[PDB]
Structures are given as C-alpha cells and as structure tokens.
Amino acid sequence: AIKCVVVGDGAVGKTCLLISYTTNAFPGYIPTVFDNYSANVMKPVNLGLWDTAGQEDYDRLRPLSYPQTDVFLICFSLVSPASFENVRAKWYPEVRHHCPNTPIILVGTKLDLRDDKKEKKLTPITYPQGLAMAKEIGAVKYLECSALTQRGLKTVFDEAIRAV
Template sequence: AVKRDQSITQPQKWLLQLSSTSPSPTIYLHLPRPVRSSSPRHSRIEGFTSLTVRAIRCVVVGDGAVGKTCLLISYTTNKFPSEYVPTVFDNYAVTVMIGDEPYTLGLFDTAGQEDYDRLRPLSYPQTDVFLVCFSVTSPASFENVREKWFPEVHHHCPGVPCLIVGTQTDLRDDPSVRDKLGKQKMTPVRKEDGERMAKELGAVKYVECSALTQYKLKDVFDEVSCAPSLLLDPYLQDLPKQAIVAALEPPQTK
C-alpha cells in the first residue's frame, strides 16, 4: 500500500479504481488522539493483513445519463470521459487513516436505466450514505429524485442518510440548453429548488457541481466524508471537517 504522511492544510482527495494489480492507498490524517475501535462492519485490505479495517460505503444513484460516472471519473482521475458508456456497476476505493485506525472508503457507481431496476438494489446492503444525483438541465431527472430514487433507497435501506447532488451545472446557463428546455416550457433546475427538495425529503444536504469544470466537485465528497452515519466515533463529531477529509496526491508513475 502507498503510505504517505501529508499535511491536511490543503486537502486533495484521491480515489483509485479497484483492480487486481492496484493496492488501496493509505492516507494518514493528523488527529489529536486515535479513534476508539468499534464498528458493525469490518474488512481486510492489502497492507493491513494483521489489522481489522472499518469499511465506509457510499452508493451513487440517479437517472441514466445525468453524469454519475463522470462525477466519479473526473474526481478520481482529473479527466473528463470523452464518450458516454452506460454503467452496469463499478466501484472505487481508498484507505483512510484516522488517528491510528484505517478506514476503507468505497464509492459504488450504479446504472440508472430501468433495465437494471432489479439488479441495482443488490449493491445497496450495508450502505452508509447515498449520493442521489440528477442533472440541473433535466427537470425530469430532478422529479425522479422524489418519485423514484428516494423511495427506492429508503425502501431497501431505511434510515441511511442521502445527499442530493445536482450535476452538470456548467450547462445551466448554456443558451442551447435553455432554448431546448424553453420549447418544452421548462427551465433548468435552480439551486434553490434543490435545497428545497433536500429539506422536504430530509436529505442531509443539497450540493451541486460540474464534473467537466470540477466546480464544487471536491465539496461533494467532503460532504460524503462528513455524513452523519460516517462519524463512527462520537469524538469525530467535534472535529473540523478538514480533519476528517482524506488528503493524498495520486502516486507518481514512471
């Protein structure tokens, strides 16, 4: 595992796509004292064969083509995908050291198409937090947050917190997008609309971003790291957010 002691004064997130040849990186955070060890779920990871590692699971859901995969790829690679390929299932992971305790943070991408409605919930068990995504250029995907996605995740995982994420904010003021929506007597989803829905549905928070420009992209995952169910130790609740967010630059390749 990549072990690197780095200051958290300028945190940079980094997640690696899981593969048989790529071990999970290890990230060290500087906290005043180690976290107490108690968690209902544990996993074993390479580099910590003698340690029990606590797992944190985040699942990303939402309509097809709203930018869920672009969200993860842009965040983890700093590159924007050149073409759209519908996702069936994909996952990313990072090992985070909080005090002396290792955590595995997993991000799970899912397919939004109706064809996968029966397959998708197989990724829901033991989820700690959901990212429920919609495109700000698609009022239909926004309405589906209320009509489909919140009912679905709360049916399978009652009580698990959700963050509502508005994607593709770089297109909100695009003339062609506004013209296309205008012909249907619609407008892009406003930030206030997202915040109102989050309050009505009891979401942890509404956040929005652009995977293309990376505007507010990091903020989305900062919120994931600080979602209520992820604070596995009461001590963490009193820490500043930047002390919980992982900090690691991508490993250098020769």
Template sequence: VFDNFSANVVVDGSTVNVGLWDTAGQEDYNRLRPLSYRGADVFLLAFSLISKASYENIHKKWIPELRHYAPNVPIVLVGTKLDLREDKQYLSEHPGATPITTAQGEELKKMIGAVSYIECSSKTQQNVKAVFDTAIKVALRPPKLKRKPHKPRPCTFL
C-alpha cells in the same frame, strides 16, 4: 450494472477506505440494484440541473426505493451539470432542457430529508471535491442513537 471504485483518503488525520458504487438507474436493473445498498453509509443521490424529469425522479423513483431498502442511510443530494444551467448556447440548442434553480434544489433537499445539497460540474470541476468531502464527513458521523466512541472504519457510499 455497478461501477465500483475504492480509494484511501485521509480525513482528520485518519486514513479511511472509501468505496464508491455507481449503480445503473435503468428499469432493467430494478431487482439487482438494491443488492448493492447493504452496508452503505451514505447515498449520493444525483439529478441533472437541466432536466426536470431527472429532478422529479428523485422524489418519484429514488426516494421510495432508498427508503424501502435502506431507510436509515443519510442522503447527500447532488445537482449535476452546473455549468450548463446558464449556458445560453446549450439551452438554445436543447429547447427541452429545463434549468433547476438552487432554491428548487434546496426545496427538494428538505422534502426528501437529505442532510446536504450541493451543485457541481464535472466539466469545470466546480464543487466536485465538496460533494465527496461532504459524503465522507456524513458517512463518518456517529449514528445519533449510539453513544459508543467512534472507531475509524471504511465507508461506502453510492
């Protein structure tokens, strides 16, 4: 149901333990998945840049779930498969693929209240580091309501 990964990362001279939980999106896991949300500092909410259904599921499925179980956790919106969005061969071989534009991604970011929107490709590695750097920086931001000094702490994002 969950794939977990942990690593120590140096951020601004401090070592931070980053925990990454990749959760199953299938309907079969709807009852188990929210158990992993407790303690999350940031969510990486990803959709495919070549799938309209994936894009629409962000607003229809994922945002209601995250806002119900973790209403105050910031979201970094991630468009994946950037390398395929303008790949003419791929698009001709997959007529059902519907490329999502950067403008549509930015619009979705505003609609769901995400703190950031990044497009990336795991195949070419374009912007992959930026996704995780952004998530770590968001997770380490002190909460707006608290005025206490920030203590280094582990961060977990999904």
C-alpha cells in the same frame, strides 16, 4: 471501510462525476464502465465508490447495490426536469425503504450547462428549486457541480464522508 453509492436517472452523468473525481481530470471519450473504486482520501478514510449505471430499468436487480451502504448520493441533472422529478417519486422511496437509516446527500449535476441555451417549456434545477427538494425528502446536505469544471465536485465527496 465506507460504502458510498451513486444513484439516479441514467444520463444524468453518474459515470462521469465518478471518473472526473477519481481520475482528477475530465477525459472526453468518456468511458461507460467505472469499476468499484476502493481508495484512501483525506483524517485517513477508506472510501468505496459504486456506480449504478445500467441498473436503472431493472427494478429487482437494482436494489442489490443498497445493502451496507454508508451514504447515498442521489443525483439529478441541474439541466433536467426529467430527472429532478424522479428523485421524489422513484429514488427516494426506494432508498428510504431499502435502507431506513442511511443518510442522503442530494447532488445537482451539471452546474456548467446550467447557464446555457425552454423550447420544451422547462427550466434548469436552480439552487432554491434543489434545496426545496432536498428538504422535502429529508436530505442531510444539498450540493451542485459539474464533471467538466470539477467545481464543488471535491465538496460532494468531503460531505459524503462527513455524514458517515
């Protein structure tokens, strides 16, 4: 077994990363629901993935996903700010507290929309911006990717395993 939980601000696209990866293709209509996924990947590991979509606003229901978790992918959108902040103030406080010993990959999502059309006086989480955070909250590894391109997408799930 290996329990891996994908957590962070809604829309960034958790559901999607998970469906990109497991489905091995982008679908978009992009489904809302992603069932708990129990899989074999390659060294043969039994890999479990958990979406946390729809749990984000309900502070007493949401940490019910954290027990016996082997590793946490915390995510922000590389094209938000809104999210990147909440990593420091909400998600890391909560993971650390609920699970003092479980490691954390920090995942920057949407490297593809990273390079695109600042009206709102803001900037995309860049690679230094990211790792400064990763470092600040004691990450095990920092990554980036998109669900569309699937670039680095395969790296994330190899590193989540590596850490376990």
